Structure 1
């Protein structure tokens, strides 16, 4: 079932979290300290009146891993409670491993997607290594201890992505989705090879798209429409996955296009330093256009733009920061289609 070996815990967060756990069930600490003996780690010995002393050993591995042992001592039933508290401070996406190869890349096409991914405030990249066969970049997250290894095999033009599907992976694949064919898109979105989005009848998917987007269908640019039909066939052919929310990437991307090109048609060009922020404020959970810009539009146009940016901003924020059933994804997908529709209808 559940295994506590080689966890990816934040080391600086262990002790604090353990202490507050103990104080939330009003248990009492017998001792918390460095682990005796060769191995580095933490020993937490706590109890509650009525049962024996629970001992939990927290070993520090050499690769930054952590292992929790609760089956020692005289109260394993109690120590497992602390073990589970520590285990549930980890994002599930931390128990996964990504190791993909995309075809047809060279350095002048890959560098831009890295620089766009480093235009977020919590993402940094740097050139890790290079010879004449491969060039390796690493993408680090400043808030979470998360690094993604992006290696470009020059002579084969093959791009390798290694690590865990966390915030660097998500930002990078989001900015990289603009360039990919159907199979590459399906690879980055479902994290599996041998996916079968390529067998979906593209003309039946296209009739799906005309049905849900009606009058906007002639105004879509084929950038937008071929990424929407490609998203449709990634969704229709998706396997069973614990989280489907990366499948929302194709729609968000086209929202980011259409909004960013509607607003510039109304005297609101989007720049690189400030971007969307210069044009919106945020009372409660809403984004609303600032009054100086809202006084130039009409009341129907102000809300199409505001709810569009709210949707785009908060679902990209929750995808990029790991929140910070295919039915939920389809609900958000059809909301998105309605949004892209309304933006073309106004």
Structure 2
């Protein structure tokens, strides 16, 4: 049912979580300490009035992984509660691994995306190595224990993305989506090598988007048209996944293409260092414009832009930090409504 070997546990919180679980269950404590011998880990022996002693060993493997042995002692039917609690304290995406190859990249197109992704909070990047053929960069997180390995074989133009799809991976691919072709975009969103979105009749997806956009359609940028049609192709060809929450990336990256742009046309450009923060405040959930901007603008436009930026950034935070298809399509329909409202 579950294997308790080699887990991705935030180690400095392990003992604290175990203790909080025990205190929640109104249990008793026998002993909590390091493990005997030279094997690094945590021995936790706990019980409650009426049963026997449940023993749980926690091996710190050399790999940073953390193995659990609840199958030790006199009560495993009881230690399994702690084992499963700690196992479920893991953010689920930590269990999947990603490793893929994208064709047609060069250092000059990769360093801008790395800088754009490093514009984030607890996400920064370094260059790990560089020889004649391949230059490899790292991305690191401070909240999670997440690292992401970006590799460039410059001799063949290959970009090799390795790691675990978490906060870092999501930020990197979101900044990357604007450059991907159809098949590359599909590959990053569904995390698979044999995609299916290249076979949708793109004219029917175009009809779909045009039907939803109406007057706002012909005013669209060509990059936005190709991106949204491609994302709709993916949504229509998406294989059965556990969490489709990433399939909203076409819409979101489209919003910044319309949001920043039109906003920069109203005397308030959003640069990378200046960011969004200098124009908005957060009272409660919906973001607001600063008062110094409610004077030159029509109230309709202020309502539109405030709802748009309220949706955005919130969705980035809900996606980058941590019947699903129905949820995804509701989200995407709201995003299309916002994109249309921004033009009219």
Report the TM-score range of the alignment, normalised by the length of the smaller protein. over 0.9
State the Cα distance separating 1:296 from its structure 2 match.
2.4
For residues 44 and 335 of structure 2, what CA distance do their matches in structure 1 show? 48
For residues 21 and 186 of structure 1, what CA distance do their matches in structure 2 show? 41
SS in structure 2 at match of 1:70: strand
SS in structure 1 at match of 2:2: coil
For residues 264 and 104 of structure 1, what CA distance do their matches in structure 2 show? 31
Q: Deviations over 1:2-57 (max 9, x none)?
A: 21111010111110111111111111211100001231100111111111111110
Report if the CA contact (8 A) 1:99-1:160 is conserved. yes
State the Cα distance separating 1:291 from its structure 2 match.
1.6
- 1:260 corresponds in structure 2 to 260
- 2:284 corresponds in structure 1 to 284
Q: Deviations over 1:140-198 (max 9, x none)?
A: 11221100000100101101000000111111101111101000000000000110100
SS in structure 1 at match of 2:73: coil
Report if the CA contact (8 A) 1:58-1:67 is conserved. yes
TM-score, normalising length: structure 2: 0.98
Q: How many residues align?
A: 344
For residues 125 and 342 of structure 1, what CA distance do their matches in structure 2 show? 37
State the Cα distance separating 1:295 from its structure 2 match.
2.7
State the Cα distance separating 1:272 from its structure 2 match.
1.7
State the Cα distance separating 1:301 from its structure 2 match.
1.2
Q: Deviations over 1:211-270 (max 9, x none)?
A: 011110011101111100010001000101011111100100010110111111111111
SS in structure 1 at match of 2:270: coil
For residues 249 and 108 of structure 1, what CA distance do their matches in structure 2 show? 23
- 1:105 corresponds in structure 2 to 105
Q: Deviations over 1:294-345 (max 9, x none)?
A: 23222211110011001111111111113x9111000000000000000011
Q: Deviations over 1:70-101 (max 9, x none)?
A: 11111111111111111111011000000000
SS in structure 2 at match of 1:330: helix
SS in structure 1 at match of 2:72: coil
For residues 285 and 48 of structure 1, what CA distance do their matches in structure 2 show? 44
- 2:169 corresponds in structure 1 to 169
TM-score, normalising length: structure 1: 0.98
Report if the CA contact (8 A) 1:61-1:67 is conserved. yes
For residues 309 and 223 of structure 1, what CA distance do their matches in structure 2 show? 21
SS in structure 2 at match of 1:295: coil
Report if the CA contact (8 A) 1:46-1:54 is conserved. yes
Report if the CA contact (8 A) 1:141-1:147 is conserved. yes
More moved, 56-65 vs 267-276? 267-276
Report if the CA contact (8 A) 1:124-1:142 is conserved. no
For residues 91 and 66 of structure 2, what CA distance do their matches in structure 1 show? 15
For residues 290 and 109 of structure 1, what CA distance do their matches in structure 2 show? 35
More moved, 98-107 vs 29-38? 29-38
For residues 40 and 143 of structure 1, what CA distance do their matches in structure 2 show? 24
For residues 117 and 225 of structure 1, what CA distance do their matches in structure 2 show? 24
For residues 197 and 146 of structure 1, what CA distance do their matches in structure 2 show? 30
Give unmatched runs, 5+ long, in structure 1: none
More moved, 121-130 vs 329-338? 121-130
SS in structure 1 at match of 2:302: helix
Q: RMSD of aligned C-alpha atoms? A: 1.4
State the Cα distance separating 1:274 from its structure 2 match.
2.6
